[PDB]
């Protein structure tokens, strides 16, 4: 129908064009009759008629008189819908300052007038004055005054000078200002003046001004003159059940405003003295303030008791304003909800549903089939028929259901498996039966959860539901390729019981030709369920080009496992079933079934798993009794010896040997050791409980005790919970978080005392409150992430770029945590993979990679894979297809359109419930030695020390890859070197971290070069030996004279001349910091690498701080420019550091709060982006120094470390596209041959499509700089403003879009959701292809 939404400022002519009458009188209704009162808020002759097509006096109740107004009462007879459409207005005697431009911070009239806000509030609230056109006076133009100063201005200049007060004077200020002269003056002062705050405020002022001249607005429109009023139906008069009216407070506000304005007109009729009308106009300004935004000015007005009331800003802001209450979430007809129940006989492509709800929902369909069969032609008798529920209507209902899907929906919708589709099957009763496996997708137990049904009406929606949102179409998850149809608890227990090997029972040691007679034996009872038996199976391998080959043999197996074999489809091998079949096992069974046999065998295989699992879990009888938990008899002795040991440590404290904290730590360690002893004891005594005969004497096997199976299957709980049910439940924390010194010795199979139960009550309530507030911050995180990656839709098929990030598996300095395969898997390469058979084109450079190709990659042992990424995608207004690779939860590549930002935000913020909130290296594996950023020399001992700070140790294995990586400090003691081989566990990496090294490059004499004794240094004598050391102190405790007398240690030869360092001509001068302990004295020659001085010394909000990209509490700063380093002026607050390039220009300095333990010396040459003081790594400096790819690598490795530490895996693509939408904006360096301003901030895609064609012609492009905004910030500064009106505030956004006149072209999801057309994401993206192809 239409296009972009234009916004601007209200003009008084536009206001008078909008309205259809002045409300001159503040009445509301008659309240004696129900008729409205003339010319009040509920006015007929302004707004329209109460009832449809009936005049107020009752003249023309006929449709024939449509259009003609009355003359007895003057009512335009039309519908009553026009009382929803016509606005109104109030003529105002006083011009009025609009409140948002007053107090937006930044105030638009505030910085527009180049005037502080305090004087503006003093002018508006009638307690000051201001100058309008002083001229030839002693008074400046912007100058504000007071009353005695007003008497002065009456004395000296009661003539030609003039001045006013209040908002009328602000209107005169806005009328009395040229804009082009202000533009010229501010541009000149930008070219001339050289102060940073002046540059900032003037560039904001000139941005506002030249944007405002670009806008079609006048500044005095920011001062209200005529107040537009809402239609009456939007502020309606509702009576309660009684003789009153409890309405909205808008009507009370307008009542106050009209009374105030009419009494002000009457007090401009009687010509009052001016102090009273100052107070009266102040009350009117207050009234308009309270009408627009109550509470934004100080102490707010109220309604009922003292409670602050609702205004327009409350109608648009906040949670319960219209965007989050009535636009993005709307109540919807054809809906229902009930308590869920199971009905296990169902297949997963269907759900149960009550008959009465189905008869409630599908009423128009039943009406349609009723008058199609013609059992009742009309509709009212038909409605009585469906009210009666006669004999024919149920067959009609079974007609209209049979192939019509519905949507099922648990209310806390975290991720996109919160809503699915099902084909209903009518069930008696009153509760929704629901297929059980799918419950694990909803995270919905049967404790009383209320799932809601919706019904699609139209034919396209039925095809969307059956074709996209069906349960069959979703068996993998958009988190990652773990199938979400993992079975939950009962059926996995039944399977784990069904495939296990007892050593002897009936049928042990015979042979069987087929699994059919195995089932025939088990249903007979003439055998065990499970016994190691050689049978014949037959498997079907499709090793050829999609062609079945049947092979067979005898396999040793168990009998129930053979029974399970009659369920698996053809292509799976036998070895998938020959194990115990835990939860991980059956999950990867379904995964391999999906990877080999497509879809339909996997779905029917899941159905048959569920049926047979429930059947043989019923045949099992896996109960639990009190004798099913076995207390180890060692526990009495273990607690006794632990009590003896803590008595020993306590009596060693009362003798005075140790401290209290040492006692605390040693006692808590011996308690933890005894706890692990109890753990080992109970785990042994469970898992080898079965010691039985074998048809011979004796044999142990894995135990058929119940709770060991319910823990070993992985059904519910793990070693922690079964540890608490048998052994002691360790230690619990106090509310301060200090771990409690006297642990919980008892266990739940025995009794508990009062006290340990009380301690665990502290722990449990702490856990519950943390889950509550954790779900709170998780919800707010999900909301921010869906409104920061709102706009992003895959729109193209290739962008044809070579760039991409690098992929290596993750190592912190322990095991290789997540291997190269899973990060590479499903993503499309950037450049070709080069095996170390160098120049072997192993894969083509721009191809998709699935799991067979990943096995080809892994067995060829590839160490680093260059791959395309979403942040490096080069797509205009979107993301290309091949940078996104496999759409996870499906097999193939992403289709053209299917938007990823929403599934990214959901798959990040979903496991937030499952999260938590609040020396020397012994190298492990065996391989050759590699170093990165290496610079080394051999010491006097023969060992190898490293003369570079940023050196990493890599351990090449026997394969060639990197399996171990370690952070080595500057100057470690290696027993081996590079180009060599170390053994498994041979100690090489060792250093002393407590002392920073002064290890020397060269050898020679150490004189006392620039070492002043008594003024710069001090002489401290070690009391333990007597061989002392010189001690250089800091900059403030000594005098200021020796502050510029630097400590130095310079190497000279046997002739005393300066030893020349190879590489330069500079000697070896070594500078020292304050608070050091200088080692040597005169007359000693040092070795290369010799110490010359003894130098002294995270949860969900971590995630939230990363996506905000905050500076931490102590930001680790880095080097801004390459070159040699040098110090500067001492302690003008900080210590300044100046890097001078070897060939470039020096003048950047960086202040350092020098209380930090710094890293760099004074004579070092470093790369840009190199560390100065250590600490947490700030993201913005990494972007503006290192690059885009390094900073996205940092964020993805940190947040993958968090989500992987909690063990719930998220694929990298979602995090990467969030990172892309973080840095969507940019900042301009130079204008170039384009027309952008220098300090203009503008988004990256806009300036990219700008300068892309400006290089395509003869002109030159421009330079930019991407700045890395937070998630909540880059949502705001967008092409749209309606998204930011939906997100987190309204006042700032709508003032900015008001002064911009920003023509809001839709371009995105939620904007197109508000206007209610199709979403340009999927089927709507094809629709918008068509409509954009029109224009």
């Amino acid at each position: 129908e239409f296009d972009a939404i234009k916004i601007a400022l209200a003009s008084p002519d536009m206001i008078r064009s909008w309205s259809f009458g002045e409300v001159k009188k503040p009445e509301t209704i008659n309240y004696r009759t129900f008729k409205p009162e003339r010319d009040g808020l509920f006015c007929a002759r302004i707004f329209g008629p109460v009832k449809d097509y009936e005049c107020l006096c009752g003249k023309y109740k006929r449709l024939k008189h449509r259009g003609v107004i009355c003359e007895k009462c003057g009512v335009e007879v039309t519908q009553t819908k026009v009382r929803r459409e016509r606005m109104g207005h109030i003529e105002l005697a006083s011009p009025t300052a609009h409140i948002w431009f007053l107090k937006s911070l930044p105030s638009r009239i505030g910085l527009l007038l180049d005037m502080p806000l305090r004087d503006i509030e003093r002018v508006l609230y009638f307690e000051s004055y201001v100058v309008i056109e002083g001229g030839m006076t002693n008074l400046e133009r912007q100058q504000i005054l007071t009353e005695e100063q007003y008497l002065d201005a009456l004395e000296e200049f009661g003539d030609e000078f003039d001045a006013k007060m209040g908002a009328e004077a602000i209107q005169a200020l806005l009328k009395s200002m040229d804009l082009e002269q202000e533009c010229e003056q501010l541009r000149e002062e930008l070219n001339e003046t050289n102060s940073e705050t002046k540059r900032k405020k003037l560039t904001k002022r000139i941005k506002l001004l030249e944007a405002f001249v670009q806008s079609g607005n006048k500044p005095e429109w920011m001062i209200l003159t005529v107040l537009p009023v809402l239609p009456p139906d939007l502020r309606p008069l509702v009576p309660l059940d009684g003789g009153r009216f409890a309405t909205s407070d808008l009507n009370d506000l307008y009542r106050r405003v009209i009374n105030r304005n009419n009494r002000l007109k009457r007090l401009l009729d009687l010509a009052a003295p001016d102090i009273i009308v100052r107070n009266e106009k102040r009350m009117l300004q207050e009234a308009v303030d309270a009408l627009l935004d109550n509470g934004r000015r100080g102490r707010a007005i109220t309604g009922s008791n003292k409670r602050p009331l609702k205004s327009l800003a409350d109608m648009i802001k906040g949670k319960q304003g219209r965007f989050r209450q009535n636009l993005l979430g709307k109540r919807v007809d054809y809906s229902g909800r009930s308590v869920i129940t199971v009905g296990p006989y169902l297949r997963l492509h269907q759900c149960g549903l009550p008959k009465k709800m189905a008869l409630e929902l599908f009423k128009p369909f039943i009406y349609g089939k009723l008058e199609l069969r013609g059992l009742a032609t009309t509709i009212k008798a038909a409605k009585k028929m469906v009210e009666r529920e006669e004999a024919v209507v149920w067959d009609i209902l079974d007609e209209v259901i049979r192939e019509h899907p519905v949507l099922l929906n648990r209310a806390p919708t975290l991720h996109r498996l919160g809503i699915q589709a099902f084909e209903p099957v009518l069930i008696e009763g009153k509760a929704i039966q629901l297929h059980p496996l799918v419950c694990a997708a909803y995270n919905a137990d049967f404790d009383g959860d209320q799932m809601a049904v919706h019904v699609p009406l139209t034919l396209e929606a039925q095809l969307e539901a059956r074709a996209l949102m069906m349960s069959t179409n979703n068996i993998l998850s958009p988190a990652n390729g773990e199938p979400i149809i993992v079975p939950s608890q009962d059926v996995v227990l039944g399977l784990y019981y069904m495939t296990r090997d007892c050593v002897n029972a009936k049928g042990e040691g015979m042979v069987l030709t087929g699994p059919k007679e195995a089932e025939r034996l088990y249903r007979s009872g003439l055998a065990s369920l499970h016994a190691r038996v050689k049978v014949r199976i037959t498997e079907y391998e499709k090793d050829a080009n999609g062609e079945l080959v049947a092979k067979t043999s005898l396999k040793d197996t168990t009998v129930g496992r053979a029974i399970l074999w009659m369920i698996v489809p053809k292509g799976l091998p036998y070895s998938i079933v020959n194990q115990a079949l835990g939860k991980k096992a059956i999950s990867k069974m379904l995964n391999t079934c999906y990877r080999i046999l497509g879809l339909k065998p996997t779905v029917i295989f899941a159905d048959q798993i569920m049926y047979t699992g429930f059947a043989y879990a019923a045949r099992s009888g896996a109960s639990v009794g009190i004798d099913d938990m076995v207390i180890p008899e060692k526990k009495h002795e273990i607690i006794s010896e632990a009590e003896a040991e803590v008595a020993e440590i306590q009596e060693q404290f009362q003798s005075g040997l140790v401290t209290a904290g040492e006692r605390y730590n040693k006692v808590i360690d011996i308690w933890a050791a005894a706890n692990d002893r109890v753990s080992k004891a109970m785990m042994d005594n469970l898992q080898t409980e079965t010691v039985i005969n074998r048809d011979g004497q004796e044999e142990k096997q894995v135990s058929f005790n119940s709770i060991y199976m319910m823990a070993d299957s992985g059904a519910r709980g793990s070693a922690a919970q079964i540890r608490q049910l048998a052994g002691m439940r360790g230690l619990m924390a106090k509310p301060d978080g200090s771990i409690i010194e006297t642990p919980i010795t008892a266990n739940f199979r025995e009794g508990l005392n009062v006290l340990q139960y009380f301690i665990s009550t502290h722990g449990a309530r702490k856990g519950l409150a943390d889950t509550a507030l954790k779900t709170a911050n998780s919800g707010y995180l999900t909301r921010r992430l869906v409104d920061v990656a709102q706009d992003l839709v895959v729109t193209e098929d290739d962008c044809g770029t070579h760039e991409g990030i690098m992929m290596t598996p993750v190592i912190e300095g322990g095991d290789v945590k997540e291997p190269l395969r899973d990060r590479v898997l499903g993503r499309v390469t950037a450049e070709d993979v080069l095996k170390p058979g160098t120049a072997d084109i192993l894969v083509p450079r721009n191809t998709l990679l699935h799991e067979q190709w990943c096995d080809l990659l892994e067995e060829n042992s590839v160490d680093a894979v260059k791959v395309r990424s979403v942040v490096s995608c080069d797509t205009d207004f979107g993301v290309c297809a091949h940078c996104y690779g496999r759409d996870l939860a499906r097999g193939h590549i992403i289709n053209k359109g299917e938007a990823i930002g929403v599934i990214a935000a959901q798959s990040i913020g979903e496991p937030g419930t499952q999260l938590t909130m609040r020396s020397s290296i012994q190298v492990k594996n065996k391989g050759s030695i590699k170093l990165s950023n290496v610079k080394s020399v051999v010491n006097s001992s023969g060992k190898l020390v490293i003369t570079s700070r940023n050196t990493e140790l890599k351990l090449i294995d026997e394969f060639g890859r990197t399996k171990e990586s370690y952070k080595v400090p500057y100057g470690a003691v290696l027993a081996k070197g590079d180009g060599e081989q170390v053994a498994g566990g041979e100690t090489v990496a060792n250093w002393d971290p407590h002392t920073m090294p002064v290890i020397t490059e060269v050898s020679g004499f150490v004189r006392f070069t620039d070492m002043i004794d008594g003024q710069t240094i001090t002489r401290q004598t070690d009391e333990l030996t007597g061989l002392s050391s010189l001690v250089v102190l800091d900059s403030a405790e000594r005098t200021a004279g020796g502050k510029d007398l630097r400590p130095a240690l310079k190497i000279v030869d046997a002739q005393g001349n300066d030893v020349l360092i190879p590489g330069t001509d500079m000697p070896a001068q070594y500078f020292l910091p304050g608070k050091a302990i200088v080692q040597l004295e005169d007359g000693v020659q040092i070795s290369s690498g010799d110490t010359l001085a003894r130098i002294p010394q995270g949860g969900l909000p971590r995630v939230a701080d990363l996506f905000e990209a905050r500076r931490p509490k102590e930001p680790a700063i880095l080097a801004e420019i390459s070159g040699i380093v040098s110090f500067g002026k001492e302690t003008k607050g900080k210590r300044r550091l100046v890097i001078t390039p070897v060939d470039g220009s020096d003048p950047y300095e960086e202040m350092i709060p020098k209380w930090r333990q710094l890293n760099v010396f004074e004579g070092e040459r470093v790369e840009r982006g190199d560390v100065i003081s250590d600490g947490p790594e700030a993201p913005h400096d990494i972007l503006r120094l290192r690059g885009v790819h390094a900073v996205t690598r940092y964020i993805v490795n940190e947040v993958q470390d968090v989500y992987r530490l909690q063990g719930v895996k998220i694929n990298d693509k979602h995090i990467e596209v969030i990172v892309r939408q973080m840095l969507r904006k940019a900042t301009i360096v130079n204008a170039g041959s384009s027309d952008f301003l220098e300090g203009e901030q503008v988004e990256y895609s806009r300036v990219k499509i700008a300068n892309r064609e400006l290089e395509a012609n003869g002109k030159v492009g421009a330079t930019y700089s991407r700045d890395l905004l937070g998630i909540t910030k880059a949502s705001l500064a967008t092409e749209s403003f309606i998204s930011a009106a939906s997100f987190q505030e309204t006042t700032r956004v709508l003032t900015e879009a008001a002064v911009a006149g920003k023509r809001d072209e839709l371009r995105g999801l939620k904007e197109n959701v508000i206007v209610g057309r199709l979403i340009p994401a999927g089927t709507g993206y094809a629709y918008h292809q068509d409509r954009m192809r029109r224009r």
Binding site: F2, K6, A8, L9, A10, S11, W18, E85, M87, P228, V229, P231, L234, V238, L292, L312, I316, R322, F323, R324, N326, L327, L328, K330, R331, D333, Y334, R337, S338, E360, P364, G368, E371, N409, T413, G418, A452, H454, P456, L457, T458, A461, Q462, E464, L468, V786, G897, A905, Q906, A1298, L1309, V1313, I1314, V1315, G1316, R1317, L1318, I1319, G1322, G1324
Partner: protein, 99 residues
Amino acid sequence: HARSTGSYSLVTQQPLGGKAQFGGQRFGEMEVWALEAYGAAYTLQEMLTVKSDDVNGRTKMYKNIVDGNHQMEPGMPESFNVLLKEIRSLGINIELEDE
């Protein structure tokens, strides 16, 4: 508790909430995000326009379902117009534009 077509609300032409007042469910905000996450679009378009807000579209929908057709007629959500009359009830000029 369920609903086919009941009372609509007064300040916004939207379905009511509750069982006592004979209303329907709330298709919440994250559910709109869930539908956006799937490639489905027509479901959402008839959801928050035809089945919920626009009076002309839903009355013609009622006639079309009793007359055998399955076809939506989008038009415009009424709540969007209510939002626009409130923002225009501020000192803000906001309008609609070209064909």
